[PDB]
Symmetry: D2
Subunit: 210 residues, 4 copies
């Protein structure tokens, strides 16, 4: 499973441990359908969330730095990211579409905002290459690159923490760009843990957009 997001981003599922029944087993402390599904709803409605910690996902995410900064505020998870100091990058940048501004009364056309963003990114990138060419190390030269530069990371997260992430980020108060990522995370979650996901939406989900 891989879902494209924004202009060059994506969320890709790398691995998953367990499924809905992993939470049921943990709740019953028992290794060895209607009753199991009823238990999942029960746990969710009463806030008995610890059993959901025994379901774990690993994702591979490509996102602009400003999105990644918000995402990385979720401390109850594991992250490994490309190195700005040492890694080869593709040097791609998130350029908002004109539709992103639709809704706001701007004194220049949305298409022109897009163009100005693209221009300043190109200038920053060209300054960066000149610095590199003249022998400035990457860890210094890259500081002139803008916040819409794409990075990549691995994210390992359990279903309880993932639900918190969806509560906060799959919500209209979150920035639109990370909402888009959160929708994709939700889709993958739903595919792998349909009972947990449905119970979550029904009883515990605090956001609006799902």
């Amino acid at each position: 499973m891989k879902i494209d997001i924004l202009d060059k981003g994506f969320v890709e599922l790398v691995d998953v441990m367990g499924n809905d029944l992993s939470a049921v087993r943990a709740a019953r402390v028992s290794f060895d359908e209607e009753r199991d599904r009823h238990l999942i709803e029960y746990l969710m409605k009463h806030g008995h969330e610890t059993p959901f910690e025994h379901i774990v996902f690993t994702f591979h995410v490509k996102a602009p730095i400003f999105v990644a900064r918000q995402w990385f505020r979720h401390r109850i998870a594991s992250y490994n990211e490309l190195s700005g100091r040492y890694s080869k990058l593709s040097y791609e940048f998130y350029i908002p579409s004109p539709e992103r501004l639709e809704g706001y009364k701007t004194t220049i056309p949305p298409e022109r905002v897009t163009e100005k963003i693209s221009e300043i990114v190109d200038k920053a990138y060209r300054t960066y290459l000149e610095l590199i060419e003249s022998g400035v190390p990457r860890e210094v030269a890259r500081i002139v690159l803008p916040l819409n530069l794409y990075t990549r990371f691995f994210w390992t997260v359990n279903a309880r923490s993932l639900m918190n992430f969806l509560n906060l980020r799959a919500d209209s108060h979150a920035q639109w760009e990370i909402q888009q990522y959160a929708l994709a995370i939700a889709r993958i979650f739903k595919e792998k843990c349909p009972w947990t996901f449905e119970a979550f939406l029904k009883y515990a989900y605090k956001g609006d957009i799902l």
Copy 2:
């Protein structure tokens, strides 16, 4: 399926595992993609030797453990993990108790024979258990009645833990300063870890393991 017996009635059972040694390699490189055994194994050693531990967080285990409460209290001090335990207030229990073997005391100068210590422990547990049943029979709820049961009562739990936190657990508990009973559990955890992540385990022993027992035992 891996299940190892511990103490007189305890066990550690593997329930599930996400990933393997290559999960750490992929996370370190940030590449979901190009396998090369010698370079991959070299990267695991490199990470371990230089203390780059975050890639090991992407390997995760779930165990099912049966252990006496005094062991579980030590275990549950490891906060970077997930636990679900039987309820003392509401769950059915089997009411089994850890009775140390006479060999457990061999090593200490005692004024009574080790066999007699074992017997006295068995006796007081039986008395406690019988008092407990009398309380239950007379209508005292379990959450109150169970407080007279001793600390060697067995409980069960699920434990989900990543390999980084697992290595911390082994550093601290697979060690002669840890209580002998929890050492026995830690050796079983190590055996399972070794079986599932042999490269990580070997690199851990070689570069990062701070304890004493796992360099001797196998």
Copy 3:
């Protein structure tokens, strides 16, 4: 501040970093009415991270079965007496007869209390005999019952503390830990009155603290 709990337990405040204004400063990243209004605003909209910048240290004396529940709260720091090495006072929680009032028992509540006292005395005497004969503490203590009192230090931030109160200052929690949670709430209220009142009004999910002053 030290509050007695159960028959021999307590909660004592050791230290506190900050006060209500610590959360205000952290939220603003740098007039009492506007500051109090901000605390209510944060609490009402679920902006909880600023409350992480208020921290408490408590010293708690509680029976092991209560401590086991308490220590499930992972987002906190604990240091407890060593069962293997520490000197203990060997005291035990004996429920009062009133603790059983509410349950139809076939023996009088006073008799339940007595039977508990008896079995703890027997366990404790067996323990002393084991110790006297040279059995090390780390082994001998395993015969002691779960109502043995222990002590610990607990360092915890106000956000995690509010989670603790949501779960433990609540009628679904065991009565014994409810009593501890009420004392924690009293101390919290004394040190962070605005946070506490906003918590009760907008975020508290339990039942007992809306009833009990």
Copy 4:
């Protein structure tokens, strides 16, 4: 209260502290000079680190985003940062000094690298103001700003986690810029917990520069 200036416009300021060296001693003994100092050394040399969690600091930090991204990887701590979406910013940028490049054979003089960095940040900043003036919301407009933009945050952290931070960041493998911040954090730590700090350097500190 203590404030140390870092880089060209950054700082680390101590906001508050709970406890001191004796807080760790009290927690280790569970009880409310030579023997106390000896206990701190003992704990440190044997890796008995949990008592140090009962010492807690709050800092106020002003640092460039690229430094903040490294810092915020330390999950065992609490953070509150200025909002890129909603907060007023001062719009200041870290411009490396010519001495920062000394050590590297560059084909342009270090002073010219500094100038080029200043230029591209000015251009990015001016593009940003134009976008703002034309009604583009801040959460979109700010994505063109470079990674050397200064941000501010509150950081609450216990001494155990602070020692892990110093092991990793007060070290020559860490980027030079965050080394400077780590040195200031270490200064403050030393001032408030001298026995802990000395024991840490003696027995546990894994880095080189302290």
